């Protein structure tokens, strides 16, 4: 058996995955420079770890085109990695923050009539989490839209909004690999944005309700390794987003869960189909 | 019968479609400003005509989420609209120009070893012949990759190339709707890039080979209304590309085929589930 790993840089997570995969068979490290299609590759499965989400999606599709399954799959990377497509998939399956999508700034200006102020504006494809905006009034809405419009990426012209959820100084990050909950943490911060890439401090979460809600969120998609973002709110737990390109080095350290090992085990299972 | 049409501006195509749809039922003209989701729309089918490829994709997906079928579908819009995904679907079904895909600058530099020079670089999501480059040597390749790199859009990091095909001063644009060949034209230019959007000129094409090839190309996707791009080469007809938000005003004028009418008739058939 031969397990491929596609990467941009060798983060802590990638190194952990390489060692775990070696317990199952031959590990082939595929930097982006080694990815050329159509090509002759001899792999049973590829673990997709490209830092760019779009490179990850296309890398997954290309290996699928060569008959090589990938974790995650191109389908999941596309649906889960897009906030709007993801939200549509979660809607009716799990509680989510009130949301709204418009296709023009003219339409976007009506979004407050449904959601009220404050609201959150975020790009459909981002992470870490860049370009999040807390919009408290129409002037801010207008500024955000004008800026979004002059940016080049046409994806910035899909206007996705959520109600602003008043969290208690933190949010939740859980992990589900296959149908199996592997662990969950709290991300604390003084600022309303709580990413660990932004500076959020991790602590272990053992709330059984979030384990339950996490598996349900995964079941909305029905495949893969997912990092799930959950908010606590006045009206209960809400599933915010899902991430098909999971970082976990703090989550693993804090919880003591073997996120890398679980991901590899899921990959070998995917290799067996 | 209530037929929606989503648009950005009313080009000739959209005006013709509006008129033909009026003969089958109530037409509901939906500018991008009128698009707000979730929402209650009372349509039996929506015809997707947004000028932005990405806005078309998302409004298709959004209507589908309201249980309203869309022509074209979000799936076809994405698969057919992306050069790389589309090439993966066309491959082995119809002849295509030799192609290569790389995921980084370093991998792209090896492409000439497979394809030789001259080769063609083009963005995976583009239309209207924009950002196409004829690359005659390594200096040109490096130039194109350097510029690609500095462009904001991460989609420009998916490097798609074809061999340069020596066409006879023109290419072929054909139309297949619901499996039925409805017409084809030559697009002439003194420049290798023949799009009418860049000044290329339509003439009628009555070659029986293109009709058959065009239907085979459509059958790779098996649904919807596709505008298909074909090249004549010293090794016979090659399928280059497929387009899920067809323009046709010059094509209709020149062939006398009712492309708007055929698109609408197909839409009323999908409206009947």
């Amino acid at each position: 058996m031969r397990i491929g790993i596609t990467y941009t840089v060798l983060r802590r997570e990638e190194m952990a995955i390489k060692e775990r995969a070696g317990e199952f068979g031959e590990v082939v490290m595929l930097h982006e420079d080694d990815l050329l299609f159509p090509g002759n590759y001899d792999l049973d499965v590829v673990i997709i770890r490209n830092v760019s989400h779009f490179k990850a999606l296309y890398t997954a599709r290309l290996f699928e085109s060569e008959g090589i399954p990938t974790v995650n799959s191109s389908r999941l990377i596309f649906e889960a990695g897009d906030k709007l497509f993801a939200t549509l998939r979660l809607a009716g399956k799990v509680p989510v923050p009130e949301w709204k999508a418009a296709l023009s700034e003219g339409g976007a200006l009506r979004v407050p009539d449904s959601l009220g102020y404050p609201l959150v504006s975020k790009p459909v494809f981002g992470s870490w989490g860049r370009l999040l905006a807390k919009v408290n009034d129409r002037d801010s809405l207008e500024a955000v839209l004008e800026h979004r419009k002059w940016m080049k990426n046409p994806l910035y012209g899909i206007h996705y909004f959520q109600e602003f959820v008043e969290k208690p100084g933190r949010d939740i990050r859980s992990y589900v690999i296959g149908g199996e909950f592997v662990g969950a943490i709290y991300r604390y911060s003084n600022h309303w944005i709580t990413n660990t890439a932004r500076g959020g401090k991790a602590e272990p979460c053992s709330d059984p309700e979030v384990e339950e809600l996490s598996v349900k969120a995964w079941e909305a998609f029905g495949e893969g390794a997912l990092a799930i973002d959950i908010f606590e709110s006045e009206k209960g737990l809400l599933v915010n987003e899902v991430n098909p390109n999971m970082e976990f080095k703090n989550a693993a350290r804090v919880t003591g869960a073997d996120m890398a090992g679980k991901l590899v085990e899921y990959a070998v299972e995917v290799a067996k189909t | 019968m209530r037929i929606g049409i989503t648009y950005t501006v009313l080009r000739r195509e959209e005006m013709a479609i509006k008129e033909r749809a009026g003969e089958f039922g109530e037409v509901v003209m939906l500018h991008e400003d009128d698009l707000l989701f979730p929402g209650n729309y009372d349509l039996d089918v929506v015809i997707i005509r947004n000028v932005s490829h990405f806005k078309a994709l998302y409004t298709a997906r959004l209507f589908e989420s309201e249980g309203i079928p869309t022509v074209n579908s979000s799936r076809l819009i994405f698969e057919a609209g992306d050069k790389l995904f589309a090439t993966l679907r066309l491959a082995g079904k119809v002849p295509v120009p030799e192609w290569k895909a790389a995921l980084s600058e370093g991998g792209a530099l090896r492409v000439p070893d497979s394809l030789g020079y001259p080769l063609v670089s083009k963005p995976v999501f583009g239309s209207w012949g924009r950002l196409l480059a004829k690359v005659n040597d390594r200096d040109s390749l490096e130039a194109v990759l350097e510029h690609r790199k500095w462009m904001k859009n991460p989609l420009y990091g998916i490097h798609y190339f074809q061999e340069f095909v020596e066409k006879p001063g023109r290419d072929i644009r054909s139309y297949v709707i619901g499996g039925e060949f409805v017409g084809a034209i030559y697009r002439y230019s003194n420049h290798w890039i023949t799009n009418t959007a860049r000044g290329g000129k339509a003439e009628p094409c009555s070659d029986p080979e293109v009709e058959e090839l065009s239907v085979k190309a459509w059958e790779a996707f098996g649904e919807g209304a596709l505008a298909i791009d074909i090249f004549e080469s010293e090794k016979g007809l090659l399928v280059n590309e497929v387009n899920p938000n067809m323009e046709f005003k010059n094509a209709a004028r020149v062939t006398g085929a009712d492309m708007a009418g055929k698109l609408v008739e197909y839409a009323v058939e999908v409206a009947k589930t």
């Binding site: 840089v9 830092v51 760019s52 989400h53 779009f54 490179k55 790009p123 494809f125 981002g126 992470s127 870490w128 860049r130 370009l131 990426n153 991430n243 390109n245 970082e247 | 904001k152 991460p154 990091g157």
Partner: peptide, 9 residues
């Protein structure tokens, strides 16, 4: 590291 693209995660 290279410049973080709007795509990174």
């Amino acid at each position: 590291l290279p410049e973080v693209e709007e795509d990174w995660g």
